[PDB]
Design a protein around this nucleic acid. Sequence first.
RNA 1: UAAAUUAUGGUCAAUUGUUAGUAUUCAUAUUAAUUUUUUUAAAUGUUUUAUCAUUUUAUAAAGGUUUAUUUUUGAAAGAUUUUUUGUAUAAAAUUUUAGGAAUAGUUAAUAAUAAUUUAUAAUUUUGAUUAGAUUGUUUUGUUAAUGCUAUUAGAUGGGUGUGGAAAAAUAAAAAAAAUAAUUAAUAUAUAUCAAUAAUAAAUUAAAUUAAUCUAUUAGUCAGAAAUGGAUGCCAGCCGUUGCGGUAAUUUCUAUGCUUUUAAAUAU
Lengths: 116, 238, 58, 194, 355, 199, 55, 190, 89, 87, 180
Amino acid sequence: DQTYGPHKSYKYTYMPDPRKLAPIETTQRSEIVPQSIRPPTSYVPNHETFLERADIHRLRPTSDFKASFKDWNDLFTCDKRQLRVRGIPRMTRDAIRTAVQAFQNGNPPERFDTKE
Amino acid sequence: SRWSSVWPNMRYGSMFLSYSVGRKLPMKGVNWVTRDSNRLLNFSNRYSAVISDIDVKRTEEELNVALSDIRWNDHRRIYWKCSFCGSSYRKNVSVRTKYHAGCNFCKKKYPSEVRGEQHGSPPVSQAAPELTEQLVDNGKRDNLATLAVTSKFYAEWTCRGCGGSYRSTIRSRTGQVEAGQCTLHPDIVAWSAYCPSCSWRPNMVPIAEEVSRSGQFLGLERSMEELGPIPRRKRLAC
Amino acid sequence: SFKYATKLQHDEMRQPYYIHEKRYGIFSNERNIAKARRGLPFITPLYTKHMNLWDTDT
Amino acid sequence: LYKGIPRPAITNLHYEPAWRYTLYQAGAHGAQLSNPRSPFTAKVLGDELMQVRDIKSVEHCKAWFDRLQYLINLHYEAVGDIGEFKSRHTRHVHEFFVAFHDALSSLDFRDTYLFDQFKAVRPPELSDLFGIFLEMEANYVHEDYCPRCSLPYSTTRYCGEGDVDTPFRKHRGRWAPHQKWGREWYDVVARRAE
Amino acid sequence: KVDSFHANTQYQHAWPLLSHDDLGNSDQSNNTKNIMYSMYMPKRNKGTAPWFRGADTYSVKYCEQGRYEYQRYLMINRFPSEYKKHFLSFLSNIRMSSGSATIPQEALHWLLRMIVDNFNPQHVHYIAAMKTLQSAGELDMARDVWKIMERQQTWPCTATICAYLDVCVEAGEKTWAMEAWNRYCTELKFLEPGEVDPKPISRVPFSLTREELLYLPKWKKHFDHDPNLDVMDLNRFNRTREVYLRMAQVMLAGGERNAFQHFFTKLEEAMLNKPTPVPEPPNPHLVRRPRWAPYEHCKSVHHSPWRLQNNGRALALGPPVTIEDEMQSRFFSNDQFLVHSVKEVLRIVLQEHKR
Amino acid sequence: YRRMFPEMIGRTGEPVQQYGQMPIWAGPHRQHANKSEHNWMFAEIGVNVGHEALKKLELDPTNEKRRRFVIRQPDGTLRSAKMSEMRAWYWKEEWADFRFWAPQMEWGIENTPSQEQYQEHVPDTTDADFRKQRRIQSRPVKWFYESHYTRTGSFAGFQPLRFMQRRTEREVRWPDVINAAVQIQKRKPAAYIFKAIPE
Amino acid sequence: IAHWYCGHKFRHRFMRDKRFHPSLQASHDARNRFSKRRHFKTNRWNYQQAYRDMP
Amino acid sequence: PWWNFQTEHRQRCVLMYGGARTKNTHNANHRVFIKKYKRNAFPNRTRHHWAVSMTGVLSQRPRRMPWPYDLTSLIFNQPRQGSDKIGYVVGTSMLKTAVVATNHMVYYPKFNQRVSRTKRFFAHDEDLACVEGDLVHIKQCRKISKYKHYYVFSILEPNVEGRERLKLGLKAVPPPLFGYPVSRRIVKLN
Amino acid sequence: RQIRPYYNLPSKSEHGRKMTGFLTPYRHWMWKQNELWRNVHEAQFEHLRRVYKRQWLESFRVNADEYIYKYNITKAAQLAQWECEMKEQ
Amino acid sequence: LFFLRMWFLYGCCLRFVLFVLCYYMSPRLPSSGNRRVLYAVFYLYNFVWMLRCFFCCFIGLVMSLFIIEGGGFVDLPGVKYYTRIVS
Amino acid sequence: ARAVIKRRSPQLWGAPGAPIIRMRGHHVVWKFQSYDLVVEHTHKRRNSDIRLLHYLGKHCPHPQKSLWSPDTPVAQDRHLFMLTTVDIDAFKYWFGVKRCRLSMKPWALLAKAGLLPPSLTQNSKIMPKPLFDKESLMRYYLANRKDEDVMAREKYLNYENSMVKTEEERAAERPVAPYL
RNA sequence: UAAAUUAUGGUCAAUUGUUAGUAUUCAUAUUAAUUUUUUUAAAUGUUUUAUCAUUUUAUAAAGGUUUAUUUUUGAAAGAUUUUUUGUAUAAAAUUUUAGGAAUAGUUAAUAAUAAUUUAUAAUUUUGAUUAGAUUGUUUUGUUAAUGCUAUUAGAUGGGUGUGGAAAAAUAAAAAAAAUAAUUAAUAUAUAUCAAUAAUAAAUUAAAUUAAUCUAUUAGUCAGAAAUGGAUGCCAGCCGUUGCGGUAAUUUCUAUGCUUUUAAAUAU
Ligand SMILES: [Mg+2]
Ligand SMILES: [Mg+2]
Ligand SMILES: [Mg+2]
Ligand SMILES: [Mg+2]
Ligand SMILES: [Mg+2]
Ligand SMILES: [Mg+2]
Ligand SMILES: [Mg+2]
Ligand SMILES: [Mg+2]
Ligand SMILES: [Mg+2]
Ligand SMILES: [Mg+2]
Ligand SMILES: [Mg+2]
Ligand SMILES: [Mg+2]
Ligand SMILES: [Mg+2]
Ligand SMILES: [Zn+2]
Ligand SMILES: [Zn+2]
Ligand SMILES: [Zn+2]
């Protein structure tokens, strides 16, 4: 009728493998394709102007977060994880990061405000 | 929250995790005392370097751990300051003694991990001596100049343009790589000359130039001028 | 003869797929996959029976 | 017999070999160069293109040998102190060599292409290889160092201390004191040489 | 199969063991040998020795095998209706599979696929493939069609022979037409006063008496539409004179005067002294019976204000290329066919000069 | 044996060769792309490939339907797979032939790590394991000093009965204390005492 | 045998399985397997003159 | 991994090496029957449901599965299963319609044995040849009426006795003496 | 999506969408340029499309007619076998 | 195993019930004493059933609902269900 | 053409649309996650198997150490590995003959393999997108353009038939004496 | 109605309960499950367009179905100066209730017929129709094994009938007509039915990036393990024979002692 629980606890040793600890040849991908940051335009002079012209959606209230960025380089140095640390909500931070990388590609944050 | 429970990622370098009650419990039953036989300071005949790598100020502050209390095999993770490259890190003495573990930067010190000293490349002091002055000055610049010019060491430099400090690779800075390793970006030398933030402007000069000349820009230009007896196979086209 | 041979989720225990081609022609199912009502519950029946057991021919 | 249907003409194909065709060749389909070592491919590519083709395997092999003579020249005298707390271990060279020899001879990795390269790649001073290992056996027997792990007696308490690759210290295991020279280890070294 | 929490298709082909990070046995640093054997590897049932699927488990005799020899003859029959549907489909696919996207070679593909599917490639399919390929100016693939037909032991009708001789002439290879002649059209006759003119269809078509049905083995009752059965009745209209003409053309094309003189003389003599055979009505399958439509809803000729659009109801553009204004060659009298034959020979002289 | 059967030690192998790259019309703009961090292996699968039964025929360089592998080195080149890498894509194969020298067998005393062999952690010291009945161990590299023909293979193909067996049941139902024969173990004490151990 | 199927006893399961047994199936000889007794003696008092159209 | 024990499990997300990725459906649930009716009044005339009812088809024990191999597939090569059937003509009351009784096969793998079942079909005979008690060949075809997908392909055995019986003005076969069974007692005398 | 910038022709309407796609000539020129570049990509892309098409067709020819070779031999063998079994019969 | 004793667990291992009565009943000889039997109520598919079960539990400060588990047999004939805890 | 559109997962055209090669896997902890290269229709249903044309392969996005090959002092080989299984007969069929579509991630993969050029979405943000003017392009074109027939024949060999018959195999295939 | 050999070949079938005269698959066993424990999910605003419009965006609400669910290319793929084709809606098998009777817009012929065309009609005891229960024909568990025992979910009529196809009224995790984005896989605190966590459960330490967790039960007659103290057919124990009658190794309590160490107990 089985009230007694399992007959054995199967456990395997941990025995470190000298072959898996062997040094790994590494490259940094910043060596293969070098990272860089685009300098501000007259269109987008500040990080705050940027967060203003990337604000389109009612639910992507980008302009409200201006204080959570200290300067220009701070913006383009952010990635999504470290962007979550700073307490920006979800779809908002995706809007932000998307905008940034888009500006990096040569597409400035010029888009019509859909709120109305 | 919920997601707090997730185990972190354990990459290839790192051995056993000890994240579970089962994994914690048997080591919780080990209690160490420092006798004369365990004390690090007695063993300076061997481990002298390891002794001079310890942060004597910071460890007694944060960890409340005296330097006379530290075993040669000590499992506690204490603060270190690298006596080569001068960077701070936190590890256990046991791991530096049993195998060599130390500052993560000096792992990549040699040009390739697979073969440690096998480089035939000259040092930085020789091949590109003009780099030694751009190193951010911690006082260890004479040790960093000693490295291979092909070295993958991650070093910090003071940018010429804005005078600030950024972090790049020695070989990325020189451009030279060892035969049989992976080629870097052809432009890497020009691109790592400055900050990641200061780099754009100078390297956008020749492009504006080439669209000034011909009124048209294609990245093709370099490869074209590479063009101005090659063995080739018989073909089945006929 | 054992439990492992009960699991047909191995490809080694299961009559292969191509048989259904050999009976109905090659690439015949690509038609069936685009059908209006599919897989709820039912799909156009897939005939796989080892070719020495075929009732038709043998 | 002759009731029920006429005899299918294709039956003829059994008794008459005239009708067995294949309209096309094996690789006329565009695969002709699949076999790297076929004479057809040697005729199509020519020799210098085949050199270009296998250069990568040649430099693989040269890489193995270069590593080997680096380790040999490093650890050749078996006992010295080459680094901070690290000292020479013949065992390093040994185990690398075994990795090599397994690349060649093992049936799990079987990489045998490595051996087709020897008549070229192989260094002239490494031709004698087991001879060099015997010389290392002779150097390994020095008195100041432990007969088992070859660490120095004065500066070191245990077998395997401060060695990255040591067998003698395993994860949750214990430290073993240095073992001392005497007839036991003398004839151990001897049997190894043998 | 895919994308589910329990998805089996991803595990069904072999993979090297993954240790990127800790999978619960701390696989990044841990040597998994015993863990490999006793846990990770599938076993016959819980606790039994690991079940080995590797290459050493199967016998040697799997690699001793020639290709496709595991196959057995498959008799697949199907409804008569479905045969018509399928043959039609293959026909219109051999003509063209896609609009400008069709490669010439695709006709050959579709013929082959037709065989691979256990259908018999009837005469219409062969003629169609050959005409398509030749009209694409690709002559090797045409002969490849013929060789496929020969390998299937399908006896070519007179029409098929015509097509293949057209390919021969345009290729200018006499050595093909010779073997083709020798094998198939030898006994081909002309029509004389004592001949009966278009011969009635004599075939029974295939049925089974109840004793044939019950007592015979499975294969004797298996009827797949087989070209060979009606070959007699495809030939019932006597297209022979065409074959003789083509053959004259070939012997000329390959530069041989005696043989050409022979065929052309036979042909001439017969055309003068023997009755004109009754022509066959248009083949339903090669060319399609026009179906009735009202032409009312059509883009008018002037539909586009910028030009003259040709229309389904009438042609306003005018003929792009002059047409000869003669009925299909088989509708000629015998004297007319003599004339036609000479003009044909001349045309081949011209073609050979241009090659 | 070596003189009479020369072909039993393989001296030949399919050479690792570099494939020609497909031309990229986009030019330098995309040339960075295929050059990356890692190696990328690609093995083919399909109806004609991946079947263990046919394995040698599929690795046979003479066969033109031979299964295709490729590798992108981090610098962007492409090369054919080394034979090891080819064999990685088949279910693991065990070769041991017992006919001349004994192949090394798994689940032994000196093989099996602690937790499977005993249900307790036993320290691994290279000196004096009483449980394993050995006096001492010098620990050379396993296959170095031994002759190569002597190395035969490994055999895992059986149940390790101390560890895990089929159809596990209680040997004796009463008294309540006995379990299946795989549960052997020393008694855990009343609550643990930890003696400080530099000593 | 799962205990929820058919009756609370076991043998009820095998009594309904005899309904599906292959060699027990209903045919021209064995008929009305499930209720034989409702149809018993049903036509005793039903007088039917048999059908003859031939002398 | 279904071959690993209860205690041997580490990760529930993947198969480490190979094998079958298996979801455990919980077979032992102790499912029960709820009793909503009095044993006296159950709301059905012919049958009563007092326990848990086994469900599914082919999931049904003991398994009864389609058997392709029988007389019909023995004689015929069928393009589609049931495209040919041999049977007897039972009744013609409908113009151009022959009803046909036919046998097919079922296999019980538990007992390893076959049973013959029987089924009626409507077949279309244009021109009305079929007399009750003919042995006929029957084929699948175009939908003809609501229930007729089959047509009479060939008469294997005609009924010579029945035809001569008709020619004399009599019915092909004498009408069955008793009809369907009843649960009543009919007292009908003289 | 189709990107609608802010300097597109603003539609003044309260009954519908606020911005009509209509382009400043600059935007048109720009769009043309970008699209030229992607044309460069898709040229090679579809080139590879039809290349693989003929590759696959050719392999089908060769393997399928090898198949027809082996298969016909097989069914010829079976047919011979049968008519023999019937002579024996 | 006796499967009809479990009738009111309805395929579940444990039940929740409300207290109504507590009376006493005398076990089958040769066992003498008083067995405490609690008379409980619970509802399923909006039917209210009166369950009758053996009180082996510990009552503290006054409480209402119990947890019912089925056992083996007990001294007292006719009482299948037993008490685990009181809430 | 749904009255109330399914808002979250829109597409183009009616479903099922033209087959598209996708990467998809069930979501889980990042440590175990794999992907499937799958040819399927444009409009998926609840379970991805309902519309699934073919199964192209498994792709594991975890760099791995190569323990299958012997540890090799060669620098490049000891970079980590990324493993993927491609079915390329089905791929060339579907892509080439059936004219598929492609999502971007599978495109990056098949680019790494050498089946396709690198995608449209792979951007070194170092270089800009190029400029164009027609007169300069024209000067370059007039500078280099090959002969018409050469080009026509190249298009012939690439697009139409490749395997052709040299005069030799003609001579070897044409019948000999008794029927010649 | 004769043996066989050029010798282990064609790749592993193997069953573990301490019972109580005897007959009969039936309490206490192992494996699998429910009892059982927040490490894999997720928030609203779909989108263009020529402007009150028109293009793109087709199967998770419920009801309970066992002779049952079946289909095209005219959309997209799709290549091209204009017409171009044919194949489809149909069936066959497998179908549950302990004790069993009739069912019905109704069969077949005619035909773009007939709320009253013609006929000796159709379904059923070879188990119908109503009525109960139930989401149908690669998924599980046990097992040496023909078996037994699971498998979700998803197609619920018509009524200006749009659309290639009704699948058309919250509940995505399918990039949806300019490269939005790929340095991305992280999603905070919600849910539905799933997704097995006591992951070296105890001595030498983590080739880290140090982040989540402070973690315990049972027995003590039979059968590993007992003594005091109460209690006195009472109170209570009860997997089971049975125990409790002033000496209870079987209740309660205290203390020790026993265990082969992911727990007892219930189903
Ligand atoms: Mg359990
Ligand atoms: Mg089973
Ligand atoms: Mg029950
Ligand atoms: Mg009792
Ligand atoms: Mg629904
Ligand atoms: Mg019902
Ligand atoms: Mg049916
Ligand atoms: Mg139907
Ligand atoms: Mg409605
Ligand atoms: Mg005892
Ligand atoms: Mg008790
Ligand atoms: Mg007393
Ligand atoms: Mg006592
Ligand atoms: Zn350092
Ligand atoms: Zn700077
Ligand atoms: Zn030592």
